[PDB]
Design an enzyme around this catalytic site. Sequence first.
Site, PDB file in Angstrom:
ATOM      1  N   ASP D  59      21.504  -8.221 -39.196  1.00  0.00           N
ATOM      2  CA  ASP D  59      22.819  -7.932 -38.644  1.00  0.00           C
ATOM      3  C   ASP D  59      23.510  -6.860 -39.475  1.00  0.00           C
ATOM      4  OD1 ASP D  59      25.135  -8.664 -36.807  1.00  0.00           O
ATOM      5  OD2 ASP D  59      26.039  -9.088 -38.762  1.00  0.00           O
ATOM      6  N   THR D  92      28.930  -4.494 -34.518  1.00  0.00           N
ATOM      7  CA  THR D  92      28.818  -4.135 -35.927  1.00  0.00           C
ATOM      8  C   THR D  92      27.986  -2.873 -36.125  1.00  0.00           C
ATOM      9  OG1 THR D  92      27.144  -5.897 -36.002  1.00  0.00           O
ATOM     10  CG2 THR D  92      29.251  -6.322 -37.092  1.00  0.00           C
ATOM     11  N   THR D  93      26.678  -2.991 -35.922  1.00  0.00           N
ATOM     12  CA  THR D  93      25.754  -1.911 -36.247  1.00  0.00           C
ATOM     13  C   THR D  93      26.003  -0.679 -35.389  1.00  0.00           C
ATOM     14  OG1 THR D  93      24.223  -3.785 -36.348  1.00  0.00           O
ATOM     15  CG2 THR D  93      23.383  -1.635 -37.016  1.00  0.00           C
ATOM     16  N   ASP D 390      27.649 -14.740 -33.970  1.00  0.00           N
ATOM     17  CA  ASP D 390      27.635 -13.582 -33.087  1.00  0.00           C
ATOM     18  C   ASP D 390      27.347 -13.954 -31.640  1.00  0.00           C
ATOM     19  OD1 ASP D 390      27.961 -12.406 -35.521  1.00  0.00           O
ATOM     20  OD2 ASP D 390      26.202 -11.097 -35.406  1.00  0.00           O
TER      21      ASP D 390
HETATM   22  N1  LIG Z   1      16.649  -5.707 -23.889  1.00  0.00           N
HETATM   23  C1  LIG Z   1      17.348  -4.621 -24.295  1.00  0.00           C
HETATM   24  N2  LIG Z   1      17.124  -3.406 -23.753  1.00  0.00           N
HETATM   25  C2  LIG Z   1      17.807  -2.313 -24.142  1.00  0.00           C
HETATM   26  N3  LIG Z   1      18.758  -2.343 -25.092  1.00  0.00           N
HETATM   27  C3  LIG Z   1      19.088  -3.495 -25.720  1.00  0.00           C
HETATM   28  C4  LIG Z   1      18.383  -4.726 -25.348  1.00  0.00           C
HETATM   29  N4  LIG Z   1      18.895  -5.705 -26.115  1.00  0.00           N
HETATM   30  C5  LIG Z   1      19.844  -5.155 -26.912  1.00  0.00           C
HETATM   31  N5  LIG Z   1      19.957  -3.833 -26.673  1.00  0.00           N
HETATM   32  C6  LIG Z   1      20.890  -2.901 -27.355  1.00  0.00           C
HETATM   33  O1  LIG Z   1      20.906  -3.141 -28.766  1.00  0.00           O
HETATM   34  C7  LIG Z   1      22.230  -2.968 -29.278  1.00  0.00           C
HETATM   35  C8  LIG Z   1      22.507  -3.965 -30.399  1.00  0.00           C
HETATM   36  O2  LIG Z   1      23.825  -3.785 -30.904  1.00  0.00           O
HETATM   37  P1  LIG Z   1      24.347  -4.706 -32.113  1.00  0.00           P
HETATM   38  O3  LIG Z   1      23.790  -4.154 -33.402  1.00  0.00           O
HETATM   39  O4  LIG Z   1      24.095  -6.146 -31.741  1.00  0.00           O
HETATM   40  O5  LIG Z   1      25.936  -4.458 -32.097  1.00  0.00           O
HETATM   41  P2  LIG Z   1      26.895  -5.290 -33.088  1.00  0.00           P
HETATM   42  O6  LIG Z   1      26.494  -4.813 -34.462  1.00  0.00           O
HETATM   43  O7  LIG Z   1      28.293  -4.895 -32.673  1.00  0.00           O
HETATM   44  O8  LIG Z   1      26.544  -6.730 -32.806  1.00  0.00           O
HETATM   45  C9  LIG Z   1      23.180  -3.129 -28.100  1.00  0.00           C
HETATM   46  O9  LIG Z   1      24.152  -2.078 -28.087  1.00  0.00           O
HETATM   47  C10 LIG Z   1      22.314  -3.081 -26.857  1.00  0.00           C
HETATM   48  O10 LIG Z   1      22.693  -1.994 -26.007  1.00  0.00           O
END
Ligand SMILES: Nc1ncnc2c1ncn2[C@@H]1O[C@H](COP(=O)(O)OP(=O)(O)O)[C@@H](O)[C@H]1O
Lengths: 537, 98, 98, 526
Positions: D59, D92-93, D390
């Site tokens: 994360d 976050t990321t 989360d």
């Molecule tokens: N099955 C999938 N196919 C395409 N993109 C995905 C899939 N699962 C997650 N993602 C992408 O991965 C990203 C993960 O973001 P994340 O690091 O969780 O944000 P945060 O740090 O705010 O939690 C999301 O923006 C999403 O668009």
Amino acid sequence: GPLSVFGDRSTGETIRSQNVMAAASIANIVKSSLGPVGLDKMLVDDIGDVTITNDGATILKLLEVEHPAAKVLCELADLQDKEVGDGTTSVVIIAAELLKNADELVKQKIHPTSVISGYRLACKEAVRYINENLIVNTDELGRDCLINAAKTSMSSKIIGINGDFFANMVVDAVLAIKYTDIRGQPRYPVNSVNILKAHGRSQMESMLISGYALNCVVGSQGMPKRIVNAKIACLDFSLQKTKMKLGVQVVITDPEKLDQIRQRESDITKERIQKILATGANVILTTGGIDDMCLKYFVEAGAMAVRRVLKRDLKRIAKASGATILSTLANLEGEETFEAAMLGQAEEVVQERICDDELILIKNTKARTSASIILRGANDFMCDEMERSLHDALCVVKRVLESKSVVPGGGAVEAALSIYLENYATSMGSREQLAIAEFARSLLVIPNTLAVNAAQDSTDLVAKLRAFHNEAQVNPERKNLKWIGLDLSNGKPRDNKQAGVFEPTIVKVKSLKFATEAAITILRIDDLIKLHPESKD
Amino acid sequence: PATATSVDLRDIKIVKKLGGTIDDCELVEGLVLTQKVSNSGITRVEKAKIGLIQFCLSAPKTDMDNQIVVSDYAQMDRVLREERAYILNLVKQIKKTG
Amino acid sequence: PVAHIDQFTADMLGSAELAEEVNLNGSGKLLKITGCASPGKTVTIVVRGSNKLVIEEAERSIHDALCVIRCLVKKRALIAGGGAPEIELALRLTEYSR
Amino acid sequence: HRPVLVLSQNTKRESGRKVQSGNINAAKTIADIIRTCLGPKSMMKMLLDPMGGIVMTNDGNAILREIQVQHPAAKSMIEISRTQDEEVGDGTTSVIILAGEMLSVAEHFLEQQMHPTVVISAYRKALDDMISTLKKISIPVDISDSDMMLNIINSSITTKAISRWSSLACNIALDAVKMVQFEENGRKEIDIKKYARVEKIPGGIIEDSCVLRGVMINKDVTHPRMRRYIKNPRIVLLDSSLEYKKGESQTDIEITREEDFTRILQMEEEYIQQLCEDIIQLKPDVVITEKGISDLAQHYLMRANITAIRRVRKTDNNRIARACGARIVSRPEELREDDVGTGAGLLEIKKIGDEYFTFITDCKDPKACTILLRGASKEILSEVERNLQDAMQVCRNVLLDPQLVPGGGASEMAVAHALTEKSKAMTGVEQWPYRAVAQALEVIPRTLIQNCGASTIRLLTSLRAKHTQENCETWGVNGETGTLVDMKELGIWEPLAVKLQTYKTAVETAVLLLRIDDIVSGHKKK
Ligand SMILES: Nc1ncnc2c1ncn2[C@@H]1O[C@H](COP(=O)(O)OP(=O)(O)O)[C@@H](O)[C@H]1O
Ligand SMILES: Nc1ncnc2c1ncn2[C@@H]1O[C@H](COP(=O)(O)OP(=O)(O)O)[C@@H](O)[C@H]1O
Ligand SMILES: [Mg+2]
């Protein structure tokens, strides 16, 4: 033979050149944070704290200085916050350039008392000229004067957006705290606006809470966090168990009388909490302390009790909601009366979500309709910058509403004073005319700094700036060129009357009075003696 | 003047306050105090009568060691309510003076 | 000065046309009593300033100004200044030395 | 030794291009750390703590909090991820990569002799147009449907480590928010931190983890004669002690007679029996307090068949007050019938790994629940605890704002074509920094193919051509395979509050770090 002091002595033009470089060491720092093209700085401490700011007072207060001529300019910026409140980068650059041009005079074997007396003839004439060449008071422009004067202060900071979001929230905050006084004095106390910070959404989600925003929690998680048609009970005494004083002790001679004294410490305590709650009071604010035994009586009766609030926050709530700040029992040898007709009023007391904290809001307060601003930023560094920029914006609209007089900003005042004082030095000038002539060149550094930070033309834009102000004084054909300033986004002289670049009058009157008076004290350091530090004896 | 050939400069108090310029100096012939007003809810009174009090308006205590003996249930009520009635006689003595 | 509450009467009080806390814009606020019946031989000078170093010089310059009028009470005589009596002490003592 | 006549001793001064282009490289350095932790093909990053612990996570918030930096602009980016962690759950990321890319294109215009206020004024005009684009491509959500809410929380945990147990973690996080959704007065609130406690116990399997319908604590009974299994107990919550303590005074007793010392020792026993008689008037079964219980109070509750727990925490008493509906009273002689926790289900003192745990479960309508996590060790249970935090906050944003944005690259490409078509009517010097904001949004579909190993040239040329037409507009990047699949068929949907907070924080991070042209370091404070 010589002086037998154990310190250090330096005479002549050594200290006369060191005080100018001490003042220029401070002015060259804050020259990059002036005007709408100014940029902020970073103030990193030894412990790791980072402070991002561009105000002339916050930078020089945290910055350590050693020279005695440097502490004059640093304490000059601290006086601008109390007297005016936004005028605290421009005073430091003028007061250092007043010493730079006077150093060129004393190197020409001109006596500094003629420069001191020459500066007083130019400072009093600058206040005389700015008070006879104002445009209009706050009757013709109306609300457009308060918005345009607010946007001029925000242009040098992080809240200088192209819209009028932050400008309308400041004018609606000062206009809601209009406190009248005797002999016809509509005072506007800007310190009553509680400016809060929270790392949340963007700057466009800054709420304008009509009322007050208390920065505290409810405490016990059994009380209703939203009370409609609330009655605020403002009081300052700790709601804890009845502890006897130092002069009173419990000396019991009978073991049967032991438990009745132990229960009496909570019965007298709960006797106060039942007579302040049976009068319809739902919200209780306390600056002292409410222990865990007394929190049960608010959960059982369904009332909100806020403990350990600030004393400066309780006075802003009780004056705005009609509550009476009560410290103890009173009213002519009464046991427990509480004067229940003097309870506060509120439309709604609601604890909202402020991004993983608790914040209590009071809506419109039913008596005075005060205002509080909750700021929203990305991180804690932006929230400290948004608080300083909003507090300087509240001081601008305070001086306009009190003193109904505005001057054009953006170097329009310094351009008109640069040419009027040159003609003033030629009329009654015999030996002090060189100090009045250098007073006009020292005032030209304010439009000169706007051209450097904008990366525009320097010696041509200011030369075109004073070309319009010269024709407004020597050609009486109603040219109306007294409001010619600078367009830093384009690089051409513009009219500040129609553009809406307005500044208060005392942001330049008190600036020219404080910078001239500070330049006199640093001009009299022809001899300087520095003793050794007496630390370990 | 025309009655004495000496003048004490200790009868002229000088109050140093930061703010403004040298033209903001004042020659007020009355009393200027640097203390605050508690409570500051009024801060102005016309036709005022000023009184200097060297007595301490607080709980009753003596120069000798004084203690309160509590050995009864109703004796705790006789401590708090008599201390409120003590200083109320001090305030009403001040208020009835004018 | 009233020490005991039994002697606190109206004869030991003062009088003031206005006793207010003047809320200044600079370093806090002070009290200012304006007007009093039968004023004594005291006065108060409020000294302002832009820096803390100018007020310390203005305090010494006012004391150097009050001491000049203090010398005129003890001896009601004055001479010309600006290097005037030092020349006359240089010419008359030269003729006295001959 | 004479001192040197200096000014501003032992501090640094730095201005010019070394601060404007110096804060960009500090922002690019943090964005390259967590660049491999965005897509579903991400990997964990093992961290080491100064306390001696180990944080093995992927994360973006938990990684940046364990990094101590010395650069001042690098300290600003860590506080950005702390803001995104408290507002939303899975935001976050994405902000740290986007703020590093918006500053990457901002460094290009600083070399072109352009003022930084021109780029920020173009960033604020671009920020106001990114909010209006997401509200047009949104979709209303039926929050009453159970299968619709499971697809939203599954899209947020596909990146995390609980994507393998996706059928179990979605049902736990959905039932945790719907239990703690309490509304007393006219104000809806969801408190998933004070009432939805996530307790982890080392041992067992992850498939046996489930959200309990009630609370649980690690506390044994005070006496072995007390019952460890009550069917329907009447729980009474206390706050004060059941002992005899000294009063808040200077009490001293003069003992002159012989019968006085034995009377005070008997009045201490009668005072405890008086408050024990006041709690049995309502006929309870379980007495729970926060302070100690003396042995004289344990004797009177033993023969009255009362199970007493001794030292339950204050945060656990506030959590059991919502589950059983009890009132935390602080006076035993002021107990009422409304302060009794009726409606509580089965109470059982189980033992999980040579340690007793008090279970208060099977409630009728609890307003607070406890997620029981059981795994291999405390290392991976801290991962599931950080992933369920989360997973519960992304369900809180839908219940307060039921709008979904097509994630997985489809959100960034739908606005990057909207900023490109709107930039044709600019006709000014702010037109070119307005175009760079649409190019800075390309780093989110860039990251989804760089993590799975796909090509970034053949895919981004085809993905940019899919958004040339106004009909489809929802084509994203499939991180599982690596091709272009529509998000209406995959089911990857992100909430509106996540995507709005991502764009509002990444722009204002570039607003703050572009107005910095000077840095002073070396001074002290109080
Ligand atoms: N099955 C999938 N196919 C395409 N993109 C995905 C899939 N699962 C997650 N993602 C992408 O991965 C990203 C993960 O973001 P994340 O690091 O969780 O944000 P945060 O740090 O705010 O939690 C999301 O923006 C999403 O668009
Ligand atoms: N729109 C504008 N056009 C031209 N000049 C401006 C504009 N807005 C602000 N300024 C100038 O920027 C300067 C900012 O001064 P500032 O640093 O706020 O002074 P202080 O430090 O006393 O608050 C002002 O003197 C003003 O003339
Ligand atoms: Mg995620």
